[PDB]
Amino acid sequence: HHTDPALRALIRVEIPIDAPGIDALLRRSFESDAEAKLVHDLREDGFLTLGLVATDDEGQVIGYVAFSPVDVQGEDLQWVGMAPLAVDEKYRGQGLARQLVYEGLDSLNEFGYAAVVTLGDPALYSRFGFELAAHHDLRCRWPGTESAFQVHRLADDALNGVTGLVEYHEHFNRFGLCGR
């Protein structure tokens, strides 16, 4: 008895040739082009800490997650903010977002980062281990985010004694991003 290998998407760090595919995915996946424009600007200016792509058998980008640096109370503690996160509508419900976030966080830990923040629906991000940032006395700069701003430590004690304003790069101060 022979079983055909199951068809699956591979996840890896993005490379330059992926940019147009990432852009197309972001434009088609969100309600506005803000996410695509954000990623373009972060990459162009050197503030995209890490990006991971999920690709189909032909190498087409079908999923994406990115991370950029954030400071806390104006200091660099090796924290990052996760955004955006997208899976092509053709591949939704297959566990690819879960995998992208897990691998992202695992890679970040491997490379010495201490925590990851994100802004979004807690009904989604809590599934991946994120906790409400307000419970740890952490906030972002935007209004109406106390229920959506979240944090995932990468070390058990990473959040202890770390409080206040978590600042994203200024490229995030554009309108229409998910979670805002």
In which element (H, E) is residue 19 found?
A: helix 19-29
- Spatial neighbors of 19 by CB under 8 A, at least 6 apart, are 40, 43
Which position among 24, 77, 114, 124 is part of the footprint of ligand COA (CB under 6 A)?
124
Which tokens is 173 given?
């101060």
Cis peptide bond prior to 122, omega within 30° of 0: no
Give the range of 9-17, 47-55, 69-77, 93-101 binding ligand COA by CB under 6 A: 93-101
8: contact with ligand COA by CB under 6 A: no
Distance set, CA 27 to CA 4, 98, 128, 159 (Å) = 34, 21, 25, 34
Residue nearer to ligand COA on the CB measure, 75 or 127 = 127
Which position among 94, 107, 145, 163 is part of the footprint of ligand COA (CB under 6 A)?
94
**65: β partners:** 52, 85
Where residue 128 falls (left for φ over 0; alpha for ψ -120 to 50; beta otherwise) is: alpha
28: contact with ligand COA by CB under 6 A: no
Residue nearer to ligand COA on the CB measure, 32 or 160 = 32
Q: Are 119 and 145 within 8 A, CB to CB?
A: yes
53: contact with ligand COA by CB under 6 A: no
- Min CB(126)–ligand COA separation in Å: 9
- Min CB(178)–ligand COA separation in Å: 3
Which position among 29, 55, 68, 150 is part of the footprint of ligand COA (CB under 6 A)?
29
Distance CA 132, CA 58 (A): 38
Stretch 102-121: interaction string toward ligand COA, x if CB under 6 A: -------------------x
146 closest CA partner among 127, 129, 166, 160: 166
Which position among 127, 137, 170, 173 is part of the footprint of ligand COA (CB under 6 A)?
127
Residue nearer to ligand COA on the CB measure, 98 or 135 = 98
Q: Which residues bind ligand COA (CB under 6 A)?
A: 29-31, 85-87, 92-98, 121, 123-124, 127, 178
